[PDB]
Amino acid sequence: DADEYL
Amino acid sequence: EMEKEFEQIDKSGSWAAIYQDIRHEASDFPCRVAKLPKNKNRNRYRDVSPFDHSRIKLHQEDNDYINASLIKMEEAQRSYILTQGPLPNTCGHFWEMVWEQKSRGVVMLNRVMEKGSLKCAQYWPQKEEKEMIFEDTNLKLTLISEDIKSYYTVRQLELENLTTQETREILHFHYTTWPDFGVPESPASFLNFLFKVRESGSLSPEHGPVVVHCSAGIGRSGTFCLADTCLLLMDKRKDPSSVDIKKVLLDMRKFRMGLIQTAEQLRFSYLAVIEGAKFIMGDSSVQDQWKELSHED
């Protein structure tokens, strides 16, 4: 959803 | 008994559950350096950090940080460096890690672009004539040759430490066919890719650890490493039946967090080891019986 990752 | 477990789990559809239990039991160690504000830009993902204890320290007195972890499988007798796909400002660090760790092979399990987005920078030269110079680290990188096969590309790169006038040949193993979503339907191509990596001597203890990366350096890189280590232990132990992929996985998570990101990647690794073991365990008829499977001309 946001740039990083999980 | 791993064949058992695979069938037993699939029939029952407990992959998420088996997986989630591994997430729950996963080790957890501090990632102090990784979270330092000056290293925010060296981390492709804020939620994917190397533990302090197994992180790779760059040999620069500057800032020794790189999002890279040393996975040392004691019993399997193999070490891997799992790292994120280099960011645009960490490509020199990556090659500096490669250089200082004496790595012979770099294993890329991803594509620079995946799901419409950049999962890793173009950290190697696509053209023989356009070498890359990493000015920050003072390394020169030249594409010598490449061998594009249907599911992977083996590149022969020449890394030059410009400081010492010393040059090394780095084999780049690029599995190019991992799908954007899910895993390969068959472990055939991955396993054959694994065996060429092995065959090249890149994983031998005579070299530094192989540098394995994907985008975050945990999911597909974890698959590669888990599968390869489980294959090492089976075809090493008194009984191959004794290798427990979950315990292997958990020992690997002691060194880097989140290895294997989905229950499908965990299932893909069980597939990979199950199939990889059959071919090596005793089919005297073959060794690499991945003809049609991986196709090959």
Residue B295 CB neighbour total at 10 angstroms: 13
Phi, psi at B257, each rounded to 5°? -75, 150
Domain B1-297 in CATH 3.40.50.970? The answer is no
Chain B residues closer than 8 Å to A1 by CB: none
Residue pairs spanning A and B at CB distance below 8 A: 18
Q: What is the CA radius of gyration of chain B?
A: 19
Q: What is the CA radius of gyration of chain A?
A: 4
Residue B119 CB neighbour total at 10 angstroms: 18
> If phi over 0 gives left and psi between -120 and 50 gives alpha, with beta otherwise, what is residue B102?
left
B144 known member of a binding site? no
Residue B203's identity, in one-letter code, is L
Tell which of B20, B35, B47 to mutate to test the A interface (max A CBs under 10 Å). Answer: B47
CA distance, residue B214 to nearest chain A CA (Å):
12
With CA atoms as reference, the chain A residue closest to B216 would be: A5
Give dist(CA B191, CA B10) in Å, integer. 21
Q: Between B46, B258, B261, which is nearest A4 by CB?
A: B46
Give dist(CA B259, CA B252) in Å, integer. 7
Give dist(CA B54, CA B50) in Å, integer. 7
Give dist(CA B66, CA B56) in Å, integer. 7
* Six token digits for residue B294: 């991986």
Which of B97, B205, B89 shows the shortest CA–CA distance to B159? B97
Torsion sign, CA atoms B183, B212, B41, B87: negative
Task: For strands B152-161 and B166-175, give the pairing.
Answer: antiparallel
B138 with B204: CB under 8 angstroms?
no
Give dist(CA B128, CA B142) in Å, integer. 6
Task: For strands B166-175 and B105-108, give the pairing.
Answer: parallel
Inter-chain CB proximity A6 and B44 less than 8 Å? no
Give dist(CA B116, CA B285) in Å, integer. 43
Task: Please tell me if residue A1 touches chain B, with a CB cutoff of 8 Å.
Answer: no
B76 known member of a binding site? no
Tell me the structure's resolution in angstroms, rounded to a single decimal: 2.1
Q: Which residues of B are known to be catalytic?
A: 214
Give dist(CA B86, CA B209) in Å, integer. 17
